[PDB]
Design a protein around this ligand. Sequence first.
Ligand SMILES: CCCCCCCCCCCCCCCCCC(=O)O
Ligand SMILES: CCCCCCCCCCCCCCCCCC(=O)O
Length: 582
Amino acid sequence: HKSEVAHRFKDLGEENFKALVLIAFAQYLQQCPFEDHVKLVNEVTEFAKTCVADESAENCDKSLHTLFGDKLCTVATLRETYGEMADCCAKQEPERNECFLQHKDDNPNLPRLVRPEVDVMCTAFHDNEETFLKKYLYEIARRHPYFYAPELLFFAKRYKAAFTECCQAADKAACLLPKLDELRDEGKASSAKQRLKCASLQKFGERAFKAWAVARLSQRFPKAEFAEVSKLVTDLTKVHTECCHGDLLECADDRADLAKYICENQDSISSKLKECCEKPLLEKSHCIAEVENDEMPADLPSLAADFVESKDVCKNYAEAKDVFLGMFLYEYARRHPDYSVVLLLRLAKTYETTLEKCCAAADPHECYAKVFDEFKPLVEEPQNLIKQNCELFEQLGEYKFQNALLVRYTKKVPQVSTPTLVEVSRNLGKVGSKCCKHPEAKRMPCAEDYLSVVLNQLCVLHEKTPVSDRVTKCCTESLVNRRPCFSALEVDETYVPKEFNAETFTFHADICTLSEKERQIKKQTALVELVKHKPKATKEQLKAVMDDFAAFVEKCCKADDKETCFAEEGKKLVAASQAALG
Ligand SMILES: CCCCCCCCCCCCCCCCCC(=O)O
Ligand SMILES: CCCCCCCCCCCCCCCCCC(=O)O
């Protein structure tokens, strides 16, 4: 270990090394050419090979941070392409690195990546598969500077493993795309999740974050002892803090250590880690973070024993509140892998509130005795919402479900952009699709995972373009009662119907050719606009109107000559509805 580069190069391998060096140099230097970055990776790769041969060879001793920042500072243009950033090069050892991290422009101003055509992609991917994948890795990398390099490399393998399995099929497009979409979705969810966690950290402090991590890791490792859990919650919190900070090398080291640790005390944490701990250094932490819940001892007492019945609760509580409450989450969480973390945190905050009222009364034990009773309501609240919503999603398909939501929310916050109201109705509908397929045991957790990112995106958007104070209240409210805040939104009885506009409800024959996913966008955009014009409409007046419009295009799409029955039968419907809705 005389050489850091040689060790990582040897641990990682030439292939993964060249890839990670690329992703790393593309996250900083996100305005440089591909050919330019490729010249670096080759320089740095030949260098690391030198150190592998002779660990005492010039510079091989230097640390990765020094070697890395040293290479950056050699970029000829740097100053004219980046300016301010080039001033970092005047600083020393630790400041220099911190300087670069500061100028790491999150969300750059690069053109959307337009997905080529299945036939061109598949041809590019054969005529030179390496520079094809590397050229795209580079593309995605520069667009997501805070995306964890190793994980960004994990997707770039499923992408490669898709072009492999599809560009050889009869119907390549039928193969490729649906996976290229599952991936796009996945990578987008992953990125949103990471940004989400780094915000909760900053916005709500580590206390809140720790409370989250406890509940989460307790469900995951129900066999582990609270002391172990605490140990992990601590390491875990220090890892996130610095990965959030953006330092890849620092963050990478911290994650490797923690994985190495967890893998060591494997039998002390959980039985479902065998597989993950067999994998290489690169995919170990990632594997573990995704691991499945272990089975709970089954020989677990009652929470009421140590937390509601027994006396000295106030005694054990006052001694170290946070640790006592942390003991409650851990106890409750590992017994309920079927609950959502926020639901668990909601029970802990409630417990915390009672304890803070009873422990100060004449007869404490008599005050908090009925506590577990106050939990019932909080538990059934998300439970009922999930049942009623999945049952409905089963009657009407996804699309007709997405429509149901559309009407519901547009009526709550009519002030919202239609295109955005549609986007959210489609995303929420997917959540019902992905999640309702699960048994009642894994539903609430699923819902939380998905709704969380959606509700956040919703909020970051609203941040930029404020629309309703009510949405702001929920968005700025506590991260634990954020969703319930949205669930409590009410029909906007103050909204003033948007004046009619023929053009808005004017349909053409093109609606006949538009893809299913386009035919829907328009039927849906019209549905929103319709609810925005007559908000007091009923689920029956709307059902009727939607029905007329249904057969409307059927007897106009299948009709000899469209552009006519579309403008003829059209006025009829607009005029007919205008009245049947008055
Ligand atoms: C245009 C600027 C962005 C602002 C967007 C605001 C959109 C508001 C729509 C409200 C949809 C939130 C539903 C979340 C699920 C609530 C759960 C439930 O109904 O039980
Ligand atoms: C008072 C204003 C009257 C306006 C009359 C316009 C009538 C057209 C409304 C558009 C509604 C779109 C229906 C979308 C439902 C799609 C149903 C389906 O395809 O199964």
